[PDB]
Amino acid sequence: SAITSGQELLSQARVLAKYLRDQPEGWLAAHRLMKSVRHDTLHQLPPLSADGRTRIAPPGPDRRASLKRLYLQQNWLSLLEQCDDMFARGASHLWLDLQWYIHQALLQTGKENYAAIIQYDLKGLLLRLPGLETLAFNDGMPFADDVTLSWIQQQVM
Amino acid sequence: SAITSGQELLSQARVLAKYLRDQPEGWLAAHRLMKSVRHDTLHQLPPLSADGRTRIAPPGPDRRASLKRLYLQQNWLSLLEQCDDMFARGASHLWLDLQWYIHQALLQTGKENYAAIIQYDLKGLLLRLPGLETLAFNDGMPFADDVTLSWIQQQVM
User: Fold this and answer.
1) Which among A116, A121, A127 has CB closest to B127?
2) A35 Cβ neighbours under 8 A, 6+ residues apart
3) How far apart are CA B7 and CA B155, in angstroms?
4) Is A13 touching B (CB cutoff 8 A)?
5) φ and ψ at B136, to 5 degrees?
6) Nearest-CA neighbor of A89 among A64, A52, A53, A65?
7) Calpha distance A149→A146 (Å, rounded)
8) Which residues does chain A have within 8 Å of residue B123's beta carbon, measured at their own beta carbons?
């Protein structure tokens, strides 16, 4: 709960973000608080890269199939809410596709100004950690697939 | 400490940010956590605007003269540390000049990638609240002066 146990900072930040989400139109605040506590804490290029793959475990087939279902079902509000839980429960969530899912849901929900911020937030992270966009997980699953990497290199820069 | 007392969220966020700042190279994380908890919580154009001036009180001559001294003394590291305390103890800190001070210190400290993020962060806020850049406090003191507003309209957009 102090100095060591960064794990405990993440859990204390989670309860702080839970508060903000419950408040009127406080999604962004709640969302962006996790982005700063997870992305702005990573200053190392790789963590570590083995023979191609990073030692970082993929998101999990259960939860990643659950998001494809919500996208197909065009249920933006639930997809948006489920992406945040996924970002909190994983590996700094370098599953960059999650950001694309949020972006798509924000465009389809009409919140265009919010969707622009998401792009800027990601641009900043990738400015700091260059090769991050192009890396892959344990199983070989990329952090960013064809559809999302396309969006990164020509829409977010 | 829950639902009501957003004041108590700010104090709990402050202790969370204090942790991050103490960690190696965790300034940004600490900084950006305050930006999300203070700026991303404001969705209203003005709060409220009277006959020109907003009902929002200025930063305080004591602390704003203290920052000019540090800028003149070119003590970037202390200015950067003092701007964060100022952002936490004030009115959502719409004292936009604070962001310019941080930006200048980040450029002079060499952390160019960090300084770019600061600009993007501000761009997002001003995208959400348009007229914010051009408003003024109780005494008539603008949120952004000539030197900083110049930086906003042609460097941050």
Assistant:
1) A116
2) A87, A121, B36
3) 34
4) yes
5) -140, 160
6) A64
7) 5
8) 120
